[PDB]
Amino acid sequence: TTVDFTLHKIEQTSDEQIQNTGHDLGLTGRKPVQGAQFKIFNVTDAFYQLLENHDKTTAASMISQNLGQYVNLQDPNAATVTTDADGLAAFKGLAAKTNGRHSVYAFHEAVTPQPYQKAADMIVSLPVRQDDLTNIHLYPKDSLVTKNLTEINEQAVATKDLHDVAVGDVLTYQVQFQIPHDIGALADHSQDTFKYNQFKVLDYMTKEGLTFKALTAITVDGQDILKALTGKMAFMSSNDAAWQQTHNYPFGFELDFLGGTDPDAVRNLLTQYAGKRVTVAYTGIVNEKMIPDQKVGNTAEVSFDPDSKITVNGPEIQTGGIRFFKHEAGSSKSLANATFILQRMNGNVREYAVLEGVNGMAGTYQPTKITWTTNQDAATRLKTSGAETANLTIQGLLPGRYTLVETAAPEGYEILDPTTDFEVIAGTWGTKTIRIANTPVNQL
């Protein structure tokens, strides 16, 4: 006689150990995972062979840690099923007994969909007994790899796929993933070498806009393991010289836990938290190369060998800007050296823009940071160039309502419109280049 195994693949986003009873748990309200491919293997002979020297929990553990040691995972006759849209996948008609013993079956996730890490290789030793079960329901868990932007200037923010930023903003990002359940295991059929020799986390942006600041924390099970790890693991950022040697990305970092000077101490630490969720957090600074009309996302790649990776995309960021064309009234003649300050309202209070890193700039202003002051004489005096289509541009601005205040006309002219109210449109240069006239004075 036989038994069926019904798998219900589900998403894991946290630490948990749901003891599989064997029963159907109805509608659990968990998110299913589609496209997971499972193989099944009869490990009965192998299990009872081990059961001579080790107890059942230990024997089961040994096969779980090193399943490829006990079965040929590459077998073409090994029954295979892929999980449907409801997470469902069934192996049917498996022998309930094998060479006179109650059968023991192993399950291996051969193909894990993006962006998930595999369910641990599970084993089921029969029977599962009724007060036996013919259909045994299992609930294998795929750990979702995530990347989120969590804070801006050390303040929490709503999780969005698109954020509006200002130059000088410090962005906190978090990449989350699972330490493998078999991280500490040795390689299949090798008593001296290890199973994992690479635990690489590669975060990068293809477009300019961020400067790497710091690796802020590495958390697991509410423990900051960054201190214990540091020096013993490989790490580099785009601020380092040897970044450019392997990658040509503007921004990023590559963190290998097992690529450092002391992989074995690291592996030992990781083994204490095997199966648990690690948060790697880091800060970046929005810089003068962050331009409008340009969404800029990052990508994180978790990999345990050269030939595969779990890839995930973080949110995009964008910044605002504005163009003005200061001209002679009644013509397209561009007027250099007209003077403005930038104003916004904060409640019913005028604040004025102070720009950092803009000595030497006239016409195009691309600051490293913008702060705001109620002292109007401290405001950065912006000057126009003689350029043809627009002779005053500002970028790195949050969207919203501003006023360009003309504080001095260019020589030979008088101010026509002192205040010029305008709007920064999120992520763009704005609807149009705003024209500002100055009237010439017939000097004698």
Numbering used by the authors: 37 to 167, 171 to 483
Study authors write:
The L. rhamnosus GG genome also carries the genes for another pilus operon called spaFED9. The tertiary organization of GG-SpaD is a tandem assembly of three Ig-like domains, wherein a middle domain (M-domain) joins together the N- and C-terminal regions (N- and C-domains) of the pilin subunit.
In the orthorhombic crystal the three domains are arranged linearly with an elongated shape 125 Å in length. This we call GG-SpaDC for the closed conformational state. In the structure of the N-domain there is clear continuous electron density between Lys45 and Asp181 within the C-terminal region of the first (A) and last (G) β-strands, which indicates the formation of an isopeptide bond in a trans configuration. Catalytic Glu145 from β-strand E is situated in close proximity and forms a hydrogen bond with the O moiety of the K–D isopeptide bond. The side chain of Lys180 points outward from the core of the CnaB fold into a cavity formed by the extended and hook-shaped AB loop. Residues Glu52 and Arg66 form a salt bridge between the two ends of the AB loop, and thus cover Lys180. The two GG-SpaD molecules in the asymmetric unit for the closed conformational state are stacked linearly head-to-tail, with the C-domain (tail) of one GG-SpaD subunit docked into a groove-like hydrophobic opening in the N-domain (head) of the neighboring subunit. The interface between the C- and N-terminal regions of adjacent GG-SpaD subunits encompasses a surface area of ~765 Å2, with eight hydrogen bonds and two salt bridges.
